[PDB]
Design a protein around this ligand. Structure first.
Ligand SMILES: Cc1cc2nc3c(=O)[nH]c(=O)nc-3n(C[C@H](O)[C@H](O)[C@H](O)COP(=O)(O)O)c2cc1C
Ligand SMILES: O=S([O-])[O-]
Ligand SMILES: [O-][O-]
Ligand SMILES: [Cl-]
Length: 144
């Protein structure tokens, strides 16, 4: 099973989405450092915002705890993709933390959803993660 790491604030919407997924995951805490050991997709919500014509370098979209988690070189090395949450009322900033992580960390942006996600989002992410980890079996070392 693929690795999953997520962050969720007091509103618990990303936590609720992860619980609906039926896939195990590690939660980045409100404070404190953690470490992981195997490759993972990161699920994160978007904060900050308000800028109608945004830029991926304007700070505040990626939760500070996620930035700290990815400052650990080992954690960062194991990131393989990102899924982001937000609120489409933010328009050009919808789920922008996914844009920031994907572009600045150089990993694919797999999916995005609103708040705790719909049943269709849950199914799409389950299927998308299965396809994602299957594709890694096309990158195996030579045995010769
Ligand atoms: C202070 C604040 C700023 C937010 N900024 C954005 C934003 O820029 N873009 C976006 O799509 N959603 C934004 N949101 C919506 C959150 O990403 C959304 O509510 C998310 O589901 C919260 O996830 P969580 O409950 O796991 O923390 C913001 C929410 C808050 C409270
Ligand atoms: O409340 S959390 O986003 O620091
Ligand atoms: O920073 O990935
Ligand atoms: Cl809060």
């Amino acid at each position: 099973v693929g690795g999953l790491v997520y962050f969720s604030s007091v509103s618990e919407y990303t936590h609720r989405f992860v619980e609906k997924l039926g896939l195990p995951a590690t939660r980045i805490p409100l404070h404190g450092r953690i470490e992981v050991d195997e490759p993972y997709v990161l699920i994160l919500p978007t904060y900050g915002g308000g800028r109608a014509t945004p830029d991926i370098n304007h700070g505040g979209y990626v939760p500070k705890q996620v930035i700290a988690f990815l400052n650990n070189e080992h954690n960062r090395s194991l990131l393989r993709g990102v899924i982001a949450a937000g609120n489409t009322n933010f328009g050009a900033e919808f789920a922008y933390a996914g844009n920031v992580v994907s572009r600045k960390c150089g990993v694919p942006y797999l999916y995005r959803f609103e708040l705790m996600g719909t049943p269709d989002d849950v199914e799409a992410v389950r299927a998308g993660l299965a396809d994602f980890w299957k594709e890694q079996t096309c990158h195996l070392p030579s045995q010769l």
